[PDB]
Write a protein that binds this DNA or RNA. Structure first.
Ligand SMILES: [Mg+2]
Ligand SMILES: [Mg+2]
Ligand SMILES: [Mg+2]
Ligand SMILES: [Mg+2]
Ligand SMILES: [Mg+2]
Ligand SMILES: [Mg+2]
Ligand SMILES: [Mg+2]
Ligand SMILES: [Mg+2]
Ligand SMILES: [Mg+2]
Ligand SMILES: [Mg+2]
Ligand SMILES: [Mg+2]
Ligand SMILES: [Mg+2]
Ligand SMILES: [Mg+2]
Ligand SMILES: [Mg+2]
Ligand SMILES: [Mg+2]
Ligand SMILES: [Mg+2]
Ligand SMILES: [Mg+2]
Ligand SMILES: [Mg+2]
Ligand SMILES: [Mg+2]
Ligand SMILES: [Mg+2]
Ligand SMILES: [Mg+2]
Ligand SMILES: [Mg+2]
Ligand SMILES: [Mg+2]
Ligand SMILES: [Mg+2]
Ligand SMILES: [Zn+2]
Lengths: 142, 111, 95, 36, 56, 30, 47
RNA sequence: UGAGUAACGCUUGGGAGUGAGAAUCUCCCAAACCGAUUGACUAAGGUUUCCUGGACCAGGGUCGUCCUUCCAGGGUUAGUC
RNA sequence: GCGAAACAGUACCGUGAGGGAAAGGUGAAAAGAACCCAGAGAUGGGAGUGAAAUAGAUUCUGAAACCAUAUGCCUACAACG
């Protein structure tokens, strides 16, 4: 049971954001909040808001206990860039790419959540194989 | 002349509402639509806006209004006939008043 | 004469600052092709009190609604400042 | 309250996007490295 | 000088292997309980037993 | 009293707040 | 330093203006072509 | 990819305040440079860039509650220039 | 396909003649998401409408290069198209 929160067009870079996300993945709720509130980085007062919103909609919307949340996955996907022209010397020009990140944080209450994902994939692979087998008797039937 | 006018009784012949009786309040010829009361009730999620003397209150909750319907889905309703039925209409010109009048083709009922 | 050179009166802080203290100064917008004498004549034929003097302002067009998908220019305005004699104050609305 | 927008045009995220003309009128000169 | 050969996406991460961050040491205030980074005044202006600054 | 209450904000077209006309506040915003 | 273009109202209008272009056969040929291309700015007279 | 690398293009400290958030905004006290000038009036050119209030999509080589940016309103008065 | 399916000879470049782009698709119907929670807000998570909301205005389908996460295996005496 994964609850999540998202943020599109975050000004922080994914490269400079993954360093902070790797400090909170797998961490308990209170310790993650305590750790992230005292880290001198720009991408720390923005991941905190996303994390807080995720806690709120996990214990209010989906109805989870609140004492079992651990950071399941916090990642910063690559967002859309904006191209501008920086004037160089001797008449040349370069392209500055202000890069943006799409942030998503996910927390679970069950410490075995990976197993269910593999199970659904296993269920998905099996449905493909069953259709082939069901098609084969019918092919043989005709 | 026009197949559908503002006021005449009409029903719906396709869609979720079958045999949906209503009164046409207004006809948009350009978009080939027709607003019929009691049918196609939609409930817009009414926001709250306060920028005018009337907007200071603008009490709007779950107002259900009328959605326009394509004129093709509409069919005229017979009233003079003892057994009411759905049919098509003509555009005969009676020399008594030289005015065009709609008449059904499965009966002899005017309008 | 035709009195198409008196389009619309305008009321601002500057206008209301002048419209007090003995002599009143009323600011209208006029035909940009009209002259001072035409402004005085229009005021003569439609109000009845001879202006003491007339001053004119031309406001140049400038870009408006900049950055909006379709940008547009402004409209050319000529402003006229009528000043009635001591002790007279007529109403712009009500005749 | 009194938060509303009855005007036909009203937006806070004004639509705009900067473009580039790719102005790269670069050149070069001669040199002291000439083996003749 | 400029690269005559492109660096793969693996050597880049091998170089970045030393870019990981460290968790700053935190402690508990003895009068309000919130975590504060060690050897520094808390948000209440309470360092140890000394009233330092007015409350936030 | 009432005219004091009706002079706060509610800016008229050509004006700002504060110097709202002492007598003319019932024409545009009626 | 002094760049090539030093702006001036009078010089611009007297060199590339409508009246300057409408004084010779060459200018008439240029304006007809500009009308063929439907240029919004026919001459430097219009902003 | 180079690479989170080079670079960020001449100017300090503190007190109070606003604000959800302040080395960067407001006020005050200093401090440092200009002072045949970074002072004041204008020609040419620029064309609203001027004033008030609000905002922080975009731009400001950082930040921003702030801007010459954006929004709304306003501003240029001649018989003698 | 006319340079131009959109407001194209436009934006933009040049003193000037002149040169000259890119950009289409929500849903049958806006029925465009009331309300609640976090947040300063945008926004996000629920609720609701809808057949479909992983059709949500970033709006038909969504490929690869590219960036991240993870089940399983291997890898810190090793000369590697
Ligand atoms: Mg240069
Ligand atoms: Mg004058
Ligand atoms: Mg990798
Ligand atoms: Mg490194
Ligand atoms: Mg490259
Ligand atoms: Mg890099
Ligand atoms: Mg290096
Ligand atoms: Mg170095
Ligand atoms: Mg350096
Ligand atoms: Mg500098
Ligand atoms: Mg400095
Ligand atoms: Mg000195
Ligand atoms: Mg000076
Ligand atoms: Mg401007
Ligand atoms: Mg100002
Ligand atoms: Mg302001
Ligand atoms: Mg910035
Ligand atoms: Mg005088
Ligand atoms: Mg959704
Ligand atoms: Mg798509
Ligand atoms: Mg080994
Ligand atoms: Mg050995
Ligand atoms: Mg060997
Ligand atoms: Mg070998
Ligand atoms: Zn404390």
């Amino acid at each position: 049971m994964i609850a999540f929160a998202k943020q599109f067009r975050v000004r922080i870079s994914p490269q400079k954001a993954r360093l902070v996300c790797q400090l909170i993945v797998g961490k308990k709720t209170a310790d993650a909040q305590n750790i992230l509130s005292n880290t001198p980085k720009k991408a720390a007062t923005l991941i905190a808001k996303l994390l807080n919103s995720a806690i709120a909609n996990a214990t209010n919307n989906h109805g989870m206990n609140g004492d079992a949340l651990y950071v399941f996955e916090c990642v910063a996907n690559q967002g859309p860039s904006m191209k501008r022209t920086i004037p160089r010397a001797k008449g040349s020009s370069n392209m500055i790419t202000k890069r943006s990140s799409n942030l998503v944080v996910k927390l679970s209450d069950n410490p075995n959540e990976r197993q269910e994902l593999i199970k659904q994939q296993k269920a998905l692979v099996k449905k493909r194989v069953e259709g082939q087998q069901k098609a084969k008797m019918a092919r043989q039937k005709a | 002349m026009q197949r559908i006018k503002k006021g005449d009784k009409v029903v719906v012949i396709t869609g979720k509402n079958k045999g949906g009786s209503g009164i046409v309040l207004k006809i948009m010829p350009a978009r080939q639509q027709a607003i019929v009361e009691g049918l196609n009730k939609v409930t817009r999620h009414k926001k709250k806006d306060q920028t005018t003397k009337r907007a200071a209150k603008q009490s709007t909750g779950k107002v259900q209004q009328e959605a326009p319907i394509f004129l093709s889905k509409l069919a005229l309703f017979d009233q003079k006939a003892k057994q009411q039925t759905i049919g098509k209409i003509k555009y005969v010109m009676d020399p008594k008043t030289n005015k065009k009048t709609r008449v059904f083709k499965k009966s002899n009922n005017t309008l | 004469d035709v009195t198409n050179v008196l389009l619309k009166p305008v009321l601002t802080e500057k206008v209301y600052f002048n419209q007090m203290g003995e002599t009143k100064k009323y600011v209208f917008v006029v035909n940009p092709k009209a002259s001072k004498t035409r402004v005085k004549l229009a005021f003569e034929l439609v109000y009845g009190i001879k202006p003491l003097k007339v001053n004119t302002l031309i406001r140049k067009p400038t870009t408006i609604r900049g950055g909006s998908r379709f940008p547009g220019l402004s409209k050319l305005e000529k402003l006229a400042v009528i000043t009635l004699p001591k002790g007279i104050a007529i109403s712009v609305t009500g005749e | 309250x009194x938060x509303x927008x009855x005007x036909x045009x009203x937006x806070x995220x004004x639509x705009x996007x900067x473009x580039x003309x790719x102005x790269x009128x670069x050149x070069x000169x001669x040199x002291x490295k000439a083996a003749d | 000088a400029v690269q005559q050969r492109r660096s793969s996406k693996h050597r880049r991460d091998k170089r970045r292997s030393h870019d990981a961050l460290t968790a700053q040491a935190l402690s508990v205030c003895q009068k309000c309980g919130k975590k504060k980074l060690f050897h520094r005044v808390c948000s209440c202006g309470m360092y140890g037993d000394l009233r330092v600054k007015k409350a936030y | 009293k009432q005219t004091q209450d009706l002079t706060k904000n509610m800016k008229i077209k050509g004006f700002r707040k504060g110097k709202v006309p002492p007598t003319l506040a019932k024409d545009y915003l009626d | 330093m002094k760049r090539t273009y030093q702006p001036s109202k009078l010089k611009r209008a007297k060199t590339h203006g409508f009246l300057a272009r409408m004084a010779t056969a060459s200018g008439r040929k240029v304006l007809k072509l500009r009308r063929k291309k439907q240029r919004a700015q026919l001459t430097v007279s219009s902003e």
